Structure 1
Amino acid sequence: MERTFLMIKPDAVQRNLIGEVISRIERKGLKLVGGKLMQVPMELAETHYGEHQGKPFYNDLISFITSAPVFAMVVEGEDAVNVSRHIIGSTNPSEASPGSIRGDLGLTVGRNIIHGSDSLESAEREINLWFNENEITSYASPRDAWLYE
């Protein structure tokens, strides 16, 4: 089944929203398949946000993402990448739909609660970068028979 990478950012962790964010993912029907609270190594940060490398907000993205732990997640479900993006909401929390994570919980584009893989491509990249196969479980849930055909 389709999988994506999610990350609860240091802002959420420092605001004590880990529980709140996880509930919103769970209840949508996505399956938590890998997860770990971890401090982010300087190496890992740069390679993860490689694609932005030139920008006006890169220096401050590295310092931020490493300023406290994060909750790194691997979530599984049908259409996971775009479903996740849907409940996460637009980058700018001022434009993200009310009801979405960013919409309800975040204030500013730089401090916006949670990261989600933006494509099937970067999903597979990000999953392999943050997790090793043996950290990612794979299991059936009672509700699976009732989320899908």
Structure 2
Amino acid sequence: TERTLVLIKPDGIERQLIGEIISRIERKGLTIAALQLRTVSAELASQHYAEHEGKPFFGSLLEFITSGPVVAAIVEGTRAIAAVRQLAGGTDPVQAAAPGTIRGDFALETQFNLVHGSDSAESAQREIALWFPGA
């Protein structure tokens, strides 16, 4: 049983999709090991998006993730990392995400694609340690 980090971004909260997103994870057979609504500091924001520090959008990216509260959660279970990714759908909600996925059913633009899931085992360890220090 692996673990992955799931973030419900500000747009997901503003559109009242917290329960919907969690339900999909629960009915998939995965378990919620940690769940917390909280604000994000620039420090945490910077460290989460470290890999895009040079990129032009980095600026706006940090501004968004700090504009409102987010829901962070540790999802645990068999094939959890890949399962959450399958559930979420590709980055572009119209051209990459299939209908039936979170982004495919509810999103229109890449900027506001509601949720985040760790893209790999290596990535999951880093993200979980970062958001849930000591766990």
Q: Give the TM-score category using the shorter length.
A: over 0.9
Letter in 2 for 1:88: A
Where structure 2 has 5 or more consecutive residues not aligned to the other structure, the ranges are none
Give 2:3's aligned residue: 3
**CA shift digits 1:103-136 (9 cap, x unpaired):** 1111100100001100000100000000033xx5
Take 1:82 and 1:120, find their aligned partners in 2: how far apart are those partners?
Answer: 9
Q: SS in structure 1 opposite 2:93?
A: coil
Q: Which has the larger radius of gyration?
A: 1
Take 2:57 and 2:109, find their aligned partners in 1: how far apart are those partners?
Answer: 13
Take 1:43 and 1:56, find their aligned partners in 2: how far apart are those partners?
Answer: 19
Give 2:52's aligned residue: 52
Give 1:72's aligned residue: 72
1:8-19 alignment, distance < 5 Å: 8-19=8-19
Give 2:125's aligned residue: 124
Give 1:115's aligned residue: 116
Query: Taking structure 2 as the reference length, what is the TM-score of the superposition?
Result: 0.96
Name the count of aligned residue pairs: 134
Where structure 1 has 5 or more consecutive residues not aligned to the other structure, the ranges are 137-149
Query: Taking structure 1 as the reference length, what is the TM-score of the superposition?
Result: 0.87
Give 1:36's aligned residue: 36
